[model samples]
Target chain A: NKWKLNYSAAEEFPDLSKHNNHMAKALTLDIYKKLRDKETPSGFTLDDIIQTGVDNPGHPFIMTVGCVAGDEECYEVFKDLFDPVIEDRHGGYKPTDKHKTDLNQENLKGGDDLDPNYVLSSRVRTGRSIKGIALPPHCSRGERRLVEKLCIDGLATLTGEFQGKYYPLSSMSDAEQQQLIDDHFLFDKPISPLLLASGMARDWPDGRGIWHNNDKTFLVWVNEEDHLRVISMQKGGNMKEVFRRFCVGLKKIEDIFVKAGRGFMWNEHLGYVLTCPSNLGTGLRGGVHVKIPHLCKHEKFSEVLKRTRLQKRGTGGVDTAAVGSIYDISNADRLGFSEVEQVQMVVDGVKLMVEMEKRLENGKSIDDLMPAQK
Target chain B: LNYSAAEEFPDLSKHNNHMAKALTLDIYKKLRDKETPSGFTLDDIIQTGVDNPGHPFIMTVGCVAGDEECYEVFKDLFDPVIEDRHGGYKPTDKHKTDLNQENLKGGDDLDPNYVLSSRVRTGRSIKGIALPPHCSRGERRLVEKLCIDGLATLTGEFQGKYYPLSSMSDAEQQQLIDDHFLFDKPISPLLLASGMARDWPDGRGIWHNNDKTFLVWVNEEDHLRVISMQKGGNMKEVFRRFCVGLKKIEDIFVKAGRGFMWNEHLGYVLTCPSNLGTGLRGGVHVKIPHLCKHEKFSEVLKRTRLQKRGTGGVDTAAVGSIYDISNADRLGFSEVEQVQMVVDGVKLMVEMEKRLENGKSIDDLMPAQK
Candidate 1:
């Protein structure tokens, strides 16, 4: 294991730098140049960027304003998609602090060789939600049960203002929703259409959505990117092949959501341009509101295990591993290489989500993405 | 519809054992040393260290009857100078016989070079059973039925000797005894676990039996070799040991019935039989009868959980997982190896019952025996 030393002190595995600030500066400069030279959309004018910073970060459009501005019917179309889901659902994303029994000390100690910093924590991530969402006061047994339902099968409604909109999914016109689903051959009706119907928008960063609790306002996220090959050090194609299959399925869901009117936002602005540089690495919260009880316990997960075809290790336990608990959910984003693609994919994804959010409600679903049985 | 052990044996390179090297070296030496007529090599004789005179004599009887492949095994395994101490065979294990008692007794005494029936001790004889080819499940079932029922008739001394797994109604106390041996499919787990299928080579497997409980050496290459646990011992002692061990297994089924029971390697595995190299020999006996239509999902899960909690590791756990997964037909694994463990177990089990029935005296089949 490569052991890194803090320049503030000297120790074994000696640092040859002699606490040289020049070396650190050079390293920092190289990274800074890479970040600055990073590409962006062709039409993203500097003035427009500055104005955007002064205006709304996410730039969520009101459903009515959208319908009125675009004789395009995208707004009316989205209302049909959003209202039903919004009416039934009552939540948004929030970060849940994870708490787990401290793994045995012996187990954590050995990991020091692997990580060296000894900063590895014992807590297991439970699931995700935004901080603004209200959870049971103590997370007692009863509260935990409610949280599971809320995470898996429960619903939430859209609650934005004139600046935004709170369209309940139930209000959407039946034919419009059906027509969209018919066009897209997304076979599983429950997950595909339900995701579209929910008052969610897709753009890279904030595509998933924000928490809808009465007080705390934290963002929930939806991500669609393939980073399997990034950390694959010594593994073979068999491993990469399987992860690719999973990514393809997730992307299908992401694209459908983007078509509605949700868009991306950023922490990069909070860090880089705003000069609070610490937030640079922290990604924008792209969130989606969903309640997929069946997905939580799909027979395929077990079937995958039985076939010995799982690309990653660890068993998805029965019941929810508290799929709603933000503590557990935080790890979902981190399952593969969340840190590597964090900035780039989020940026591209948010831009795509914004475009889709503007068009999804109006755009016809592709026939292949629609449900087969109709 | 096909329930064979194919799915259990994946064609993974990891499982391959190259038999070429061992085969080549062994054959070359035999041809090279054609005329060396040494009954007892200069370095060693069978009885040099063994205290039991009978053991060596008994071994020779088995040795002469072993097939040519078996003799090849004996020659390849035996060294001339240093190995001469123990019949010129390397005593990698001083405990077990090298002549592959299983092959000598069960498969045809067929290894012409290594062992022959002419070598068998005068008092002893290998049980001869010839199973028909292409036999139906019904025919195989009848073999098992008669074997087990016949044994129960002898041991339990039940009147008229007719019984089955479902005979609890007429058997009363005798029915309880009868149910232990007879049921719908009437096969015993021990026989099937012997790696001997009711059909051999390809189709139609028959029951192969042995008179004495000799430890049959499992010829690594021989397909039909079957080594018994009763190796190189006295006849009376063999029967005594068999009776004692059999009773304990029976009692386990009687008393516990459902919890957990243990036998070596989970069941009787016969070497010299196909797939006997699996290193599993323990046979399982359960009180519950009739495996047909009785494989419930819940029971399977519960049993699996329980099995995992006790003495569980990859190999041990794989045993159960392999059993359940293969049984489910959800995945394809090597059917031959798996079926050898299970089907051979059932086949051997019934045959053991037949031996007990035939061996025990007529008086033993009386009410007192019951």
Candidate 2:
């Protein structure tokens, strides 16, 4: 929606709003300018701040705003997106001490069970970075290659549905690559000008690949912004099943790393570390692309989004326009929320949205839907 | 006992050799020569004959005459002696027929009943080096080093203990060898004659895990001789250990190079051709006085493809009627198949002995046994 508003705020709205948040030192525009000007700061520049500009119009510029300037490059890249609820939930910017997740088979079931009308597809994904490595922006080329090889080899050991081959970007034919992208089976090309200027694109397409199961439901991104981006997605709303499959796949990959004596980077305060602040905490994003033209047009829909701590995306993805009145909806908060609770909120909200859509189709208007004051 | 004793014998004594044996035609000469040589004269391997008159190689020049000529020239040199109580039978080449083998189900139990202990052993050598017979002192040392390094790489499954002979106390070494029924010391005369034992015990060692079930003798008469043994006639269990342990060691060697020395016709090359083919000998030390005394027992053994050794292992005097029995064929069948032959043969012998002790006719055990 920022793109529609053409309001690219200088700072992430959520972070700039956290007047009570803790920091050893206050971040300043001068410090951010030093990074942008490159006459003073080391490592990053304004390009790093706006690299996702072209592909992700109205990019949050979260790194420049949310993080302390000029240190912990990975912290800048891996921080979580702004969440007003999370800020208030903990009374500050820090996440809650307790974190929870569930991947039990029972919990992984029940998409259509709750009401299958509007949901076309559902996906849940998490990003993880290996311990002790610099984020891609500051990582050496060799380390990136190591990350790719580690993940690819680890993925190949899976049996049954998880077993599949990895196709590196460099090896795939242009047509096949395009088809995969069109089908959303592959990630969009990394075209961040900031990244190119920072040397992350030195080996452009090298050390990057996609591994998906035969059904293409369980997929992993190797050598992406994070060391790994594990995803589980399928047609139709089966959030439980999708999340279940992703959990199992993640475990298999984890065992591989354990055997190799490697582990994911984590901090008690930050959760799984990544190259983007928006990906901190559980680093999980549970989403569904559903048709909601009637509900979307209602003024109350925005309030619903704000209250549920959920965000909306166009049908194709973040930067694309919605098609057929379908919008991708997902949890907006990565921190201060347990994985299960966050997912439950999305499912419940979607159920209500679907119910509301049906009522509107029958002639109800936004004003007629408001409840009477107690 | 000493170097002089090793140098005393002329050549192997054949008639005393109970095991049936064969040799490739290519080796008939320098071996039969007892004169000027083709490659290695009889004198090169004569010391083994001189040192142990009861060995199977006493009958042939195959050791010096066969493929991998220098190595395995004395495959039967350290072979255990077959006793008259074992029916004094000979082995035959009859393995070309069936290839199927029984799964590795534990063999019949004879503990506290008829059998005392059982053992199965196989010899293996690395490919890149000369056999113990031709290897210089330095080469033998190197082979020992390779064996240790390669065996050390086996860390997970069936991983066990490794004891370098040089590192153990005299008493500890004696106890291990005696307790484990391992090979006795004193390098083979044939290797000593060819200078393979010049360094004495410099590169010698043994590796076994906590269970003492799987073992490997490094820088022994052969570059390596891995063994699998336990307390009962459970051929399946013993063979399983052997197979698993062999694979572990073989994998390390394969990664180290192409793999251990192998020949098209010889299977696995070693210091002796007698230990070729499957390089396996699955055995059990049993007590079967009634079967030994039977009139047709010798003929039954010959037909069953089994051989026996005394209680003390190779070339030693038997302490009564207790005998070590095992299948005699090594060159023509798979290891599993070879184990099956021994298991079947031993089961039959135990059955026949029981019948004789129970005063039943032995007629039914014949045709079915064959």
Candidate 3:
């Protein structure tokens, strides 16, 4: 229970004059500050968890914690912070709220591509952390190395299309790694200010690597932003297939860890424990890249996103700007819904957006497609 | 749809409750021709008032809602009583529910020594099942069975055993009653007249947790009365437990494909129209000796939006200094807001009591009365 911090050796907790996220708002609340100095069992202190938010402020809804409760003790001991932030971000999901998982792909509908010419790709991914081991932002080099070995060892038994080979970042040349990045098969190295300041990029590329099947469709990023970023993607929009592969791969991986006695950290209130509060539920994001040239330039484009419950991003990533008319659209929520519902959100949203695009091209009002607001 | 003849309908002209106040022959004529799909007529909805005529606001809710259509089938009567009883809630107004207890600010205690106990409770009905007053014997047993199955899943501190009224001994009744946790047979003419206590003990029961801190009463005034209570102050703890436990039961109903009987206009459906929206009543037994006897005590209560009851209950008056004070308005506001209203009003009452102890005037607090 002792508190410890490995970054920025000397700064007395919160300096809110430069902060504007929910963490700053919590500091102003006396009723919720009762456990201001408490630490989780793995020694992740309140200050240690919230350092990223204190360092990078001014973002709306930015109460980003670098690590979760290494154990369930963190949820109860540090609930004063976790509960409020989760409730604020998870659409009014309260402390009493419980998470339910639905992996039955049969419940989903509309799996076909909206328009073969308009659609480009479909992908679904999630983050998973091994229990009893520290998460990425706070794990030591030795711990991170062990996680890679275990994942690589357990993953070698894959059968059918899930069969894949592990390749460590430490062995790859810059040219080879750039080729993987250019193919959209790997994430860029942690060069952003967020990773640099959050202590995730400290040891360079020692324990990090990528794993992909022979088809290069199923992949896992070891010791990246999270312990595991398991992904499933393809060149055309068939959400059901992509999501089915993701679910099948996730269950097999979960079984491997469960038998290894290093099961995934989970709880009723927050589904899967993750490094960040925003990814605490299913930790899944379902996305599809499609073209909507005219609708993208319409005045009510933002309204379309709001009404459809979809979020917009550039084709490359959230940090990039859209080139031409191609955009990556996906569900805006992850914590309060199931993996199936998340995939279905993107599927339904793409269909509606395609309809709206057709209407806009016909010189008609899209008001019939876009109805009421909450 | 079918209806009994107009002569067969209950005579509201001879009644004296709130039902008698608003109900008229013209409304009866218009609604007499309509009937719910379950065959409930306008007479079935007013028979209780005709049988008993002494209560302040009987709600005139003589019959329980078999389905959501009952509310619409008799909107002429339901709307008037709901509006008149729920602080004049308008016909067009909508209701919202928020069970978050964090919104409650410092309601742990008003005066620990002065506050004897605190309890918060609310009733809910399953959407598919008939309510207490109109359900069949088979439906009653099914409700009891489903509730027990739901309560069995409560683990941790909420683990408890179910006690059916029929299977209970006299000794068990005494033990629970002594803790102020027992809900007994109906004694009020209003409840009896409404057919709430019909077929008594067939499927009625109470389930109390190991510590008796959390509880639920099935087949009572409503289908379920989820409750939380403690001996001293700390309304926050009581309300938090209540919210969590009730939400758990609500989840069970949802998974079973029969959710709580709720609507946008009436947040939670209850047998009583006065308890239309939130259907919650939060109160504490506080000993405000001086304040209870103040010249404008009743006026002070009006301003704070609270009502008083005898420690004995609705029919009896207060005993000495101790009075059961609770929030007056239940509909048109969120659940947590209603509980917080009671906590805030009690805090003000406690302060007034302290002033009265010093022989100070409470004239400033009675501004609303003036």
**Across residues A209-271, which tens digit of lDDT does each residue of candidate 1 receive?**
112123212112111110000110111112122223223322332243344322112221111
What tens-digit string does per-residue lDDT give for candidate 1 at B93-141? 2222121222212222112221111111101111121112112223234
Candidate 3 error regions (>4 Å): A1-374, B1-10, B55-67, B312-319, B364-370
| Residue-wise C-alpha lDDT for candidate 2, range B1-370, written one tens digit per residue | 1113222222233323322233222333323333221134443443333323354434422233222444334333312221121222223322232212245444655453666666777777666555665443345556676777777777664566667676788888777666754555654433333334433455578877667778888776677888887776666667776777777888888888837765544566665545655667788877788988899888877878888666653223456777878887766566776777777788888888899999898888883443
B43-142, model 3: which lDDT tens digit per residue?
5576566555555443344334545677888988877776766667877899999887777778886677778889898998887666776665456676
- lDDT, candidate 2, A101-183, per-residue tens: 45444553255443456898888888888865556655544566678778877778898988888999878988988898878
Give candidate 1's total backbone clashes.
141
lDDT ranking of the models:
3, 2, 1
Tell me the spans in candidate 1 whose CA falls farther than 4 Å from its real position: A1-294, A298-370, B1-146, B149-370
Q: Which prediction has the highest lDDT against the true structure?
A: 3
Q: What is the DockQ of each candidate?
A: 0.00, 0.00, 0.00
Residue by residue across A296-343, what tens digits does model 3's lDDT show? 999999988877667788766765556779888887667778988878
**Winning model by TM-score:** 3
Give the TM-score of chain A, superposed on the true chain A, for all candidates in the order listed.
0.17, 0.76, 0.89
Per-prediction backbone clash count: 141, 26, 0
